[PDB]
Amino acid sequence: RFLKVKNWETEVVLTDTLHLKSTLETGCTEYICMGSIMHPSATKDQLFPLAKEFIDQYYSSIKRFGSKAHMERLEEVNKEIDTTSTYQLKDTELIYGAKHAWRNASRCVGRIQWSKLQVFDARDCTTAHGMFNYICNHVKYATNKGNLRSAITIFPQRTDGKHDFRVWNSQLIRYAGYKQPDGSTLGDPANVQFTEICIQQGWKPPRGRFDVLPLLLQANGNDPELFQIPPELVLEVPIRHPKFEWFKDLGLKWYGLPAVSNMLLEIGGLEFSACPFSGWYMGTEIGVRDYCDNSRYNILEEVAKKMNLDMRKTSSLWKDQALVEINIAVLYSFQSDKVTIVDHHSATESFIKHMENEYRCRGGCPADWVWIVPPMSGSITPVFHQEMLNYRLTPSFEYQPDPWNTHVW
Amino acid sequence: CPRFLKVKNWETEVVLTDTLHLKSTLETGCTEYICMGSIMHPDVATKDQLFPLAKEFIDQYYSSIKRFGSKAHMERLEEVNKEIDTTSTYQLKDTELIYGAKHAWRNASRCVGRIQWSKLQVFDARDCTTAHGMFNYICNHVKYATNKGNLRSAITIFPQRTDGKHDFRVWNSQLIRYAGYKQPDGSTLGDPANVQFTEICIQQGWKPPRGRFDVLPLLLQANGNDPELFQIPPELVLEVPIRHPKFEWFKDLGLKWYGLPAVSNMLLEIGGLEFSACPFSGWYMGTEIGVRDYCDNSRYNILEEVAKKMNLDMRKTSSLWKDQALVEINIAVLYSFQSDKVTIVDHHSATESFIKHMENEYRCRGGCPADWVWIVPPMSGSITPVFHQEMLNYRLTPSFEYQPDPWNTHVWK
Numbered sequence A: 001r002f003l004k005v006k007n008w009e010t011e012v013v014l015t016d017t018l019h020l021k022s023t024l025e026t027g028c029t030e031y032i033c034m035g036s037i038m039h040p041s042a043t044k045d046q047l048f049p050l051a052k053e054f055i056d057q058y059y060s061s062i063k064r065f066g067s068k069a070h071m072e073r074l075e076e077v078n079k080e081i082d083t084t085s086t087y088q089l090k091d092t093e094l095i096y097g098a099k100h101a102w103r104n105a106s107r108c109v110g111r112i113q114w115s116k117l118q119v120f121d122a123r124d125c126t127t128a129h130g131m132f133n134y135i136c137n138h139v140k141y142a143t144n145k146g147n148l149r150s151a152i153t154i155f156p157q158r159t160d161g162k163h164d165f166r167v168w169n170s171q172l173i174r175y176a177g178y179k180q181p182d183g184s185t186l187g188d189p190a191n192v193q194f195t196e197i198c199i200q201q202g203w204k205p206p207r208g209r210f211d212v213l214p215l216l217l218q219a220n221g222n223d224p225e226l227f228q229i230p231p232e233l234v235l236e237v238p239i240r241h242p243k244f245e246w247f248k249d250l251g252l253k254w255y256g257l258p259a260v261s262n263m264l265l266e267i268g269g270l271e272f273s274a275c276p277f278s279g280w281y282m283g284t285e286i287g288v289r290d291y292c293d294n295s296r297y298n299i300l301e302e303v304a305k306k307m308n309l310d311m312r313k314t315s316s317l318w319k320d321q322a323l324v325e326i327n328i329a330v331l332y333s334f335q336s337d338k339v340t341i342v343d344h345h346s347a348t349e350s351f352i353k354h355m356e357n358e359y360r361c362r363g364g365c366p367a368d369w370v371w372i373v374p375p376m377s378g379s380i381t382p383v384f385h386q387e388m389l390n391y392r393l394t395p396s397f398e399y400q401p402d403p404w405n406t407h408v409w
Numbered sequence B: 001c002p003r004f005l006k007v008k009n010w011e012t013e014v015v016l017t018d019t020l021h022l023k024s025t026l027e028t029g030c031t032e033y034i035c036m037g038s039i040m041h042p043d044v045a046t047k048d049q050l051f052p053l054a055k056e057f058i059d060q061y062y063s064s065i066k067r068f069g070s071k072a073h074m075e076r077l078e079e080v081n082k083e084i085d086t087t088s089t090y091q092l093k094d095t096e097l098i099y100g101a102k103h104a105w106r107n108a109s110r111c112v113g114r115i116q117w118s119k120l121q122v123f124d125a126r127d128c129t130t131a132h133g134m135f136n137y138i139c140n141h142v143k144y145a146t147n148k149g150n151l152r153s154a155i156t157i158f159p160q161r162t163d164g165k166h167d168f169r170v171w172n173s174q175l176i177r178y179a180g181y182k183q184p185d186g187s188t189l190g191d192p193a194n195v196q197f198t199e200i201c202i203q204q205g206w207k208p209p210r211g212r213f214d215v216l217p218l219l220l221q222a223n224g225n226d227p228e229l230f231q232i233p234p235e236l237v238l239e240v241p242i243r244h245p246k247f248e249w250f251k252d253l254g255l256k257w258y259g260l261p262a263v264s265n266m267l268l269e270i271g272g273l274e275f276s277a278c279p280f281s282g283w284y285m286g287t288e289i290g291v292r293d294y295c296d297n298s299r300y301n302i303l304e305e306v307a308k309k310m311n312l313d314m315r316k317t318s319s320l321w322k323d324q325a326l327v328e329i330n331i332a333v334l335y336s337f338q339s340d341k342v343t344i345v346d347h348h349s350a351t352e353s354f355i356k357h358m359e360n361e362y363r364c365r366g367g368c369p370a371d372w373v374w375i376v377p378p379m380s381g382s383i384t385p386v387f388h389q390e391m392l393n394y395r396l397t398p399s400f401e402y403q404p405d406p407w408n409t410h411v412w413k
């Protein structure tokens, strides 16, 4: 059936037909909704239907459905799955599939940009040194001296599961975190375990508060190897405040490039277990989550101190006051250093415009309200009031197990 | 469905295990292929439909009092069954009415305030016959719940539906709301959300004072008759002028709000019976007023004027002038209620209490249905503990349900 979504602020109603194409499960049933669950729970036989469906939508996207080129490709893919148990995507199909995995990512508020994505084909890579080279080229290209450009680098697909290419880092650029003897934590507390794995593999930690972690890269199922990204490639922004001159004395900085490297890219039934992709930051990712999550840098206390706020009762809203000032400083700093960043008001505005575009030309837009609404000031952004339907379209980005739980050394 | 479902808290690593979802009754709106978890809204019962719905509720009640299978349990089952047989409906005992109402709150997946669910004063108004009598019952509710600012949660329950043509209804969506007036030039005075209901009241005879904060009259329908207008005595309507602990100019905005949030358009379902007029009230979380009532673009929409008096740069969104003013507005609301000793709860305290409640319910009851989209506050979401808490949403009965607005369905006499 046709489903309607209403915006309760503007009363705009949209009609979704695109959900009729979905396949993968959401995790919900008619009796239980799992919309706030973060992770809800091949062979020649399963592979050809998936390949067929993807080729079908590719040749439908370039308006040659049923053409001779379409027919030949379908035959070509069938023979190749027969004789090799897999198949290789054409360049054009790889690019189309990577763009549509982004387009279909229901949890991404930045998808108005989906068709502007630089795709780096790294399927000829065979070693961790080669992965390192490809990743350095990605970082330099995407950083572009602060004028960030979206990019993805795609390493060889999975074959038997025993020869997986993996980036062990969850993101290409992250700060280390160290367990202190006295119990507390220096650096980024989320990364304490991964930092420990790097140390155990030979990394010499500077034991500072903003130590860029090395890359830990696994090619063809072999043991992973360490590499230091050249520092001139890692763009950083010292965080200061436009009115509070003491804010710079907090000593805070962050990196310019957000680059997810632990997800799996699925295209036509093929699985690309190493596909680092990067864009640019929304300010709240750093200012709310990275800095103010209790289990992260957790700086609200210190900032509220320097603002001299009354911190004895929660109803003074001292946490909310310090949170806003921190996020002002983040946006001010990136902007002053001409490093691409988007605030949550502008980003959610763009996303509403994007939904409008997608309903018009595509018949829908899968969207996960739980992830789309920003982690602060929710209802004064327009996505808060926008009903969204969430469903799974392929090509897709998926979660996968952490490599240190599966790898045999 | 599987027997055990797990939810994780991503901040604390606590894992909880839910088995109560096996008792879920109606539908969520979601399917295997689509999730409707952010959709706001995704004739009578026959003798055959009513029998099992009543047995399920009676079984649950007698289980709750540790008398499942007792002689009083089997006798009550037989009495209910005979009564459905001869009359096509049945009447709840007072004990069962109170149990049912408290559990409809306990089961209300969108309510963050449920740690209080067992402390609800239930007013049995099933003997009411006229709109004047409904007015009396509602006035007593308001006075009891307000308690001079020491608010007490309460529900008043009017006669259940019979054939669907004799419904009791409070036409107001909430017992206390401010009027809104559309101007010829397109501007609105008062609360823009209430223009439609205000016009109905005016048509029915209400003489509107045409101010910014005019308490609307009650519009009360008894036994399916045409609704009738009544003015709530103003001394029963407790109000708080909003001032700011630092900004002396904030009082010059002339803002105020009423102390008592009382939802009156929902339907209470107990054992298959339908209570179409069941006004219930608690106390406010500050953000309901400071974020939604005052700062929604389609409501009072004061962010601009507050930002002006704060002398913020309003030319770029990246200055976060909106966020800065939103916090100060919510500081003022909490400060003004606390100063006047009117019960209110901030979003930090309320979500912390909800986590403790949910954990206790998981341990004692086997689960706690919760709608994350509604539980997470409309500001500063991720610095409250519920943001990081995975939730399962499902529908347990007794329950509160939405129902059609009565002006869309009423057959005028």
Ligand code: HEM
Binding pocket: A098, A102, A105, A107, A108, A109, A110, A111, A113, A117, A150, A151, A152, A277, A278, A279, A280, A281, A282, A285, A342, A347, A371, A397
């Ligand atoms: C161009 C600017 C972009 C912006 C402003 C943006 C914004 C965001 C934000 C704020 C999130 C939530 C992240 C979190 O809370 O962890 C997100 C998630 C996500 N983004 Fe985008 N993004 C951008 C580019 C991209 C690109 C280039 C891709 C892939 C090609 C992508 C795919 C995704 C996916 C798959 C998620 C879900 C991640 C997860 O489930 O952990 N995004 N995005």
Ligand code: HEM
Binding pocket: B101, B104, B105, B108, B110, B111, B112, B113, B114, B116, B120, B153, B154, B155, B280, B281, B282, B283, B284, B285, B288, B345, B350, B374, B400
């Ligand atoms: C005692 C203090 C209470 C607090 C602090 C509280 C808090 C809240 C809040 C913040 C909401 C969201 C409201 C909105 O965004 O419109 C809500 C919704 C709700 N509450 Fe509670 N509540 C309380 C008492 C009650 C009581 C006494 C009942 C019923 C007996 C109740 C049943 C509900 C229901 C059914 C909803 C869903 C409303 C809807 O869908 O429109 N609550 N509550």
Ligand SMILES: CNCc1cccc(-c2cc(F)cc(CCc3cc(C)cc(N)n3)c2)c1
Binding pocket: A110, A171, A173, A174, A190, A258, A259, A260, A277, A278, A279, A280, A281, A282, A285
């Ligand atoms: C489910 N959260 C997992 C988690 C926990 C802690 C940190 C992170 C995380 C760390 C990073 F360095 C970077 C990110 C990128 C998120 C992201 C990705 C893209 C393409 C654009 C954007 N604008 N943003 C996410 C992710």
Ligand SMILES: CNCc1cccc(-c2cc(F)cc(CCc3cc(C)cc(N)n3)c2)c1
Binding pocket: B113, B174, B176, B177, B193, B261, B262, B263, B280, B281, B282, B283, B284, B285, B288
């Ligand atoms: C989907 N929102 C519908 C909507 C829209 C605009 C206003 C309202 C609304 C108006 C009011 F006077 C009062 C409320 C109270 C909601 C509520 C109820 C209770 C028992 C405790 C509490 N703390 N809060 C809600 C509701």
Ligand SMILES: C[C@H](O)[C@H](O)[C@H]1CNc2nc(N)[nH]c(=O)c2N1
Binding pocket: A008, A384, A385, A386, A387, A388, B038, B039, B040, B373, B374, B375
């Ligand atoms: C579209 C979305 O479902 C809608 O805006 C919801 C979001 N969450 C909410 N949460 C609460 N408490 N109250 C609301 O009115 C809403 N509105």
Ligand SMILES: C[C@H](O)[C@H](O)[C@H]1CNc2nc(N)[nH]c(=O)c2N1
Binding pocket: A035, A036, A037, A038, A370, A371, A372, B010, B387, B388, B389, B390, B391
């Ligand atoms: C439990 C809940 O699903 C979890 O905390 C989610 C909520 N929404 C989110 N939204 C974004 N953008 N990022 C997140 O990490 C989360 N975490």
Ligand SMILES: [Zn+2]
Binding pocket: A028, A029, A032, A033, A034, A035, B030, B034, B035, B036, B037
């Ligand atoms: Zn769902």
